[PDB]
Amino acid sequence: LYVEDNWNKCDMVAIFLFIVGVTCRMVPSVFEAGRTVLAIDFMVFTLRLIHIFAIHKQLGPKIIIVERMMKDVFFFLFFLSVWLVAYGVTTQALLHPHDGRLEWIFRRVLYRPYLQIFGLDEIDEARVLYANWLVILLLVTFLLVTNVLLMNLLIAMFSY
Amino acid sequence: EEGRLLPAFSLHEVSRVLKDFLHDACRGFYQWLPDLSRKSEDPWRDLFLWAVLQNRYEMATYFWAMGREGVAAALAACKIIKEMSHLEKEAEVARTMREAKYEQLALDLFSECYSNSEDRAFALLVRRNHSWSRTTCLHLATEADAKAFFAHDGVQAFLTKIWWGDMATGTPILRLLGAFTCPALIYTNLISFSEAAFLLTRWRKFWGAPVTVFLGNVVMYFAFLFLFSYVLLVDFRPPPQGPSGSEVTLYFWVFTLVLEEIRQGFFTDTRLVKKFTLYVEDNWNKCDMVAIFLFIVGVTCRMVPSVFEAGRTVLAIDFMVFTLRLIHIFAIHKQLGPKIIIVERMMKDVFFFLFFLSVWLVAYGVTTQALLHPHDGRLEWIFRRVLYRPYLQIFGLDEIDEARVLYANWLVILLLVTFLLVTNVLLMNLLIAMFSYTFQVVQGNADMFWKFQRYHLIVEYHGRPALAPPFILLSHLSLVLKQVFRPDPVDQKIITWETVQKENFLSTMEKRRRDSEEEVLRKTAHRVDLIAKYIG
Amino acid sequence: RDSEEEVLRKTAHRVDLIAKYIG
């Protein structure tokens, strides 16, 4: 019966996070990680706060519809990730064939598509030709196919 | 008149032109003429042809009615009809011919027989047709491209039963993944298995099912994409030997892949040109051909040290091609399919959209530049700026800032605003309008084309040889070595069952027509007319 | 002529005349 409801399950995860965070007091050496866990648990309680919202007449429908469409977000992970990794990795190879430290390359190649989602400092040094124009075209087609389309289909399904 | 080198034409030309319409479907017809005195082997089919050719619809309908083995006819006929559309003289005569809709008859018959004893329905669907010169119904549907027929649920039922082959069962997506992860788990009863050598047979039935080989090969190819990418990233090394070791390691398997592709494309064949057109038909095989061409031309990088850079760029292009190829696996899923089909359908408007944005950008920026400056010492820098600005504008002034610090600026503002609205707001609102139009009205076509590609991939991977790509080389060797070394009552019962079902169907349709309300009105009108007459 | 409303009206006139002739 208790396992049935999802909200009680979220409460169980929250209290588990609280318990494992309480170890921060137990361990002085790893206090930082314990604090991070406690922040995670705080975020869990924040998510738990939402359960009260749908109770209202006007708020209810919106909440239910958002939760129903909330399944497509884990799906949308696929195409954007594929296009981003394809694009950036290929451009990097053209830009350079060998990096002295993997780390900095990791930071740049991670930030760019991550940055791209939110909308070149490392890139600027490299720029100052054949590779750039194809990157432009792939950027444009990507822009259209994910942002324009997979959102138009999503609002279509949301109205449905 | 072309073959020779009371109307003159004889059955020779009839059989010739029929073989022309359908190559292997109706080739054995009328086997240079026979003695006319002899009666035909099966008249009803001949007369059905005679009618459908002359486009006498109701006649052909009845001619089918009293004809056995109906469903294959109700397909071949529609094939011939749709074929005889581009060779139509009168557009008016072409429209009614295009209004044949013979496929609906086959659909109704197959639905009827599927309703009862599907174990017989599937057997029929794969039963060879003596009447139609020993051909398979599915091949007929292909030659006819009767997509709607495939959209029948019983079709999908048969496909799904095949899709897991002998193993069948519910086959949970997760449970199957886990069972495949642990080879020991196979022997246990995690999922249902239909009815040491016994364990060998069970493992064979496990890895023989279509989904299994499909998942295995797609996973291996995807991981090979990943490893090839890594090789391109840092392992694309100078002409020392170890470097080339990475290249040969990543390239020999690619050669094995192209060998497997040729095997799938050429020996899936009457003539070599036939199989060539078969391979050229599918777009995905065309993308594979472009990919392997890119791989070959990139392999020249190893050949030329001086131009290694360009070769590396080409290899990156080929990597991107393989990335695009990876998408083909996505639409297979139920939920993913429709979205993929709709996106591909709308993917045509993107090359169109090239027009307006480009025109507005070149107009705006070039004009502003002229106002900004009348002469540039170097074209290059001007090229970089004037290219980056509208390119930059699409993605959302450093050179511009120096120029700024008045009459030209405000008109640039207004043109920027109207451009913003007309492309970004409008040509996207119209695009989402057309996208909803697709995903609703052409949603039927989307589901149809999706199930179509589903059937295609299913039957294709059925023919996937029983081996991994490495051993597939040994499989081809075994096949070449084998090459160098080298009932009726049941069928009658099934045909009779089909005939009974057809008779029941037609009787039911006529009975439904009898109780039609308009017929009731007309009959009551005739009755009241007669009654008023008898009254006076 | 074959319009369904016209059919209804004609049948109504006919049944009126028939009921009249009956009585």
Classify residue A32 as left (phi > 0), alpha (psi -120 to 50) or beta. alpha
Residues A134/B317, Cβ–Cβ less than 8 Å: yes
Å from C18 to nearest chain B CA? Answer: 6
How crowded is residue B109: how many other Cβ atoms within 10 Å of its Cβ?
Answer: 21
C-alpha B132/C-alpha B346 separation (Å) is 40
Tell me the structure's resolution in angstroms, rounded to a single decimal: 4.5
Residues B457/B159, Cβ–Cβ less than 8 Å: no
Q: Which two tokens stand for residue A41?
A: 């648990």
Check A89 against B229: CB less than 8 A apart.
Answer: yes
C19 Cβ under 8 Å from any chain B Cβ: no
Residues B439/B342, Cβ–Cβ less than 8 Å: yes
C-alpha B223/C-alpha B409 separation (Å) is 54
Check B432 against A78: CB less than 8 A apart.
Answer: no
Report how this structure was experimentally obtained.
Answer: cryo-EM
C-alpha B446/C-alpha A28 separation (Å) is 61
Residues sharing a CB contact under 8 Å with residue B132, sequence separation 6 or more, in sequence order? B25, B26, B69, B72, B73, B76, B140
Q: Which residues of A touch B328 (CB under 8 A)?
A: none
Helices (H), B127-188: 137-144, 147-150, 153-163, 173-181, 183-187
B377 Cβ under 8 Å from any chain C Cβ: no
C-alpha B300/C-alpha B448 separation (Å) is 43
Residues B121/B154, Cβ–Cβ less than 8 Å: yes
Residues B121/B113, Cβ–Cβ less than 8 Å: yes
In eight-state DSSP terms, residue B327 is G
Residues sharing a CB contact under 8 Å with residue B519, sequence separation 6 or more, in sequence order? B513
C-alpha B536/C-alpha B409 separation (Å) is 95
Residues sharing a CB contact under 8 Å with residue B239, sequence separation 6 or more, in sequence order? B302, B305
- Chain Cα centroid distance, residue B323: 21
DSSP assignments along B171-216, one per residue? --HHHHHHHHH-HHHHHS-SS-----HHHHHHHHHHHHSHHHHHHH
Residues B298/B318, Cβ–Cβ less than 8 Å: yes
Q: Which two tokens stand for residue B309?
A: 């850079």
**The dihedral formed by the CA atoms of B225, B231, B232 and B237, expressed in degrees to the nearest 10:** -160
Q: Which of B407, B427, B423 is nearest to B357 (CA)?
A: B423
Q: Which two tokens stand for residue A150?
A: 């997979």
**The dihedral formed by the CA atoms of B116, B122, B125 and B126, expressed in degrees to the nearest 10:** -150
Secondary structure, 3-state, C1-23: CCCHHHHHHHHHHHHHHHHHHHC
Residue numbers preceding breaks in chain C (C to N > 2.5 A): none
Residues A17/A36, Cβ–Cβ less than 8 Å: no
Q: Which of B242, B187, B155, B197 is nearest to B451 (CA)?
A: B155
Q: Which of B28, B17, B61, B11 is nearest to B129 (CA)?
A: B28
- For residues B19-42, one letter each, b for 16 or more C-beta atoms within 10 angstroms of the residue's C-beta and e for the rest, the string is beebeebbeebbeeeeeeeeeeee
How crowded is residue B68: how many other Cβ atoms within 10 Å of its Cβ?
Answer: 15
Looking at the DSSP assignment, which residues form a beta bridge with residue B135? B129
How crowded is residue B209: how many other Cβ atoms within 10 Å of its Cβ?
Answer: 20
B530 Cβ under 8 Å from any chain C Cβ: no
Interface present between A and C (3 or more CB pairs within 8 Å)? no
The DSSP element (H or E) to which B245 belongs, if any, is helix B241-266
As separate numbers, helices (DSSP H) first and strands (DSSP E) second, chain A gives 8, 0
Mutate which of A153, A159, A160 to test chain B, going by most B C-beta atoms within 10 A? Answer: A153
- Single-letter residue type at B123: A
Helices (H), A27-129: 31-48, 59-69, 72-95, 102-118, 121-127
Radius of gyration over alpha carbons of chain B, in Å? 32
Radius of gyration over alpha carbons of chain C, in Å? 10
Check B234 against A119: CB less than 8 A apart.
Answer: no
Å from C10 to nearest chain B CA? Answer: 9
Residue B7 DSSP SS3 = coil
A148 Cβ under 8 Å from any chain B Cβ: yes
φ and ψ of B305, to 5 deg: -70, -35
Residues B163/B198, Cβ–Cβ less than 8 Å: no
Of the candidates A93, A153, A155, which has its C-beta nearest B342's C-beta?
Answer: A153
Q: Which of B330, B373, B501, B71 is nearest to A145 (CA)?
A: B330
B534 Cβ under 8 Å from any chain C Cβ: no
Residues B73/B45, Cβ–Cβ less than 8 Å: yes
The CA-based diameter of chain B, rounded to the nearest angstrom, is 115
- Single-letter residue type at B96: T
Q: Is the dihedral of CA A31, A36, A39, A44 positive or negative?
A: negative
Residues A9/A29, Cβ–Cβ less than 8 Å: no
Mutate which of C5, C7, C22 to test chain B, going by most B C-beta atoms within 10 A? Answer: C7
Radius of gyration over alpha carbons of chain A, in Å? 22
